[PDB]
């Protein structure tokens, strides 16, 4: 199977607060594994999966120092951005970064990622070529030029192709057994809805990872049905359901399908 690492970083400024709060959260295969929070008593990168306790004090020292650098970086940047957007003192602002790499089943780099958002909106992002930048806003051109003139892309490229892959490989070796998936377990419930009609609700439960698809069909055609957003059980696994309104006494015509990477093939069921 394919793999990935991300680091999701946030800085937030607020009216009263002297200094922005900075949080960095790292992910391997979308499970959180390291975290830094400037609001902590003693701000440091802490392990967030039992398999990271392996890394020795050098690791945590250097990653923590790396964090303190970002904290500065995000802070100066937030200040610059205020100026670029002619925003005055007296508001809240957020600067966000996602960085990382995707590997294929072969463990070779498939894609690097480097993007940033301001006020929850795309500000500037490194293109898939890892050479050029995309930057929508007129304010953002100021940055794009700065970074073009400074060769920023090449140094991020080095990181994404190098350290990111190198250390994900290492985390993946250290972490086997995030390797496994949990298949969904499906059932259907019956609920009255109106006169003449009822509600069939296909539940999927106990699955990891989150990505899953639920469908309903009536003699072979899919439907257009209510679906909830996939939600955490709170125990590492996920839940989803999808529902359709059905005529009374015609419920054995309707079939639910569940699709998930953990399955040997999709599951098929109906109400019983």
């Amino acid at each position: 199977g394919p793999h990935s690492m991300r680091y999701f970083e946030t800085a937030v400024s607020r009216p009263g607060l002297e200094e922005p709060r900075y949080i960095s959260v790292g992910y391997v295969d979308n499970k959180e594994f390291v975290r830094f929070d400037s609001d902590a008593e003693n701000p440091r990168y802490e392990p967030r999966a039992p398999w990271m306790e392996q890394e020795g004090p050098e690791y945590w020292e250097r990653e923590t120092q790396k964090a303190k650098g970002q904290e500065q970086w995000f802070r100066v940047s937030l200040r610059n951005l205020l100026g670029y957007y002619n925003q005055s003192a007296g508001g809240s602002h957020t600067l966000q970064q996602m960085s990382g790499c995707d590997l294929g089943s072969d463990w070779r780099l498939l894609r690097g990622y480097l993007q940033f958002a301001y006020e929850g909106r795309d500000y500037i992002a490194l293109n898939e070529d890892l050479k050029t930048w995309t930057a929508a806003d007129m304010a953002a051109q100021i940055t794009r030029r700065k970074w073009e003139q400074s060769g920023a892309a090449e140094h991020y490229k080095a990181y994404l192709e190098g350290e990111c892959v190198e250390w994900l490989h290492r985390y993946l070796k250290n972490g086997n057994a995030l390797l496994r998936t949990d298949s969904p377990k499906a059932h259907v419930t019956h609920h009255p809805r109106s006169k003449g009609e009822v509600t069939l609700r296909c539940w999927a439960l106990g699955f990891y990872p989150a990505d899953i698809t639920l469908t309903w069909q009536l003699n072979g055609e899919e439907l257009t049905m209510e679906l909830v957003e996939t939600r955490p059980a709170g125990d590492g696994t996920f839940q989803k359901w999808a529902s359709v309104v059905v005529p009374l006494g015609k419920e054995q015509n309707y079939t639910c399908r569940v699709y998930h990477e953990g399955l040997p093939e999709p599951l098929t069921l109906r109400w019983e």
Partner: peptide
């Protein structure tokens, strides 16, 4: 391991 950003915005 986390990125260490270069030029500021």
């Amino acid at each position: 391991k986390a990125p260490a950003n270069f030029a500021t915005m």
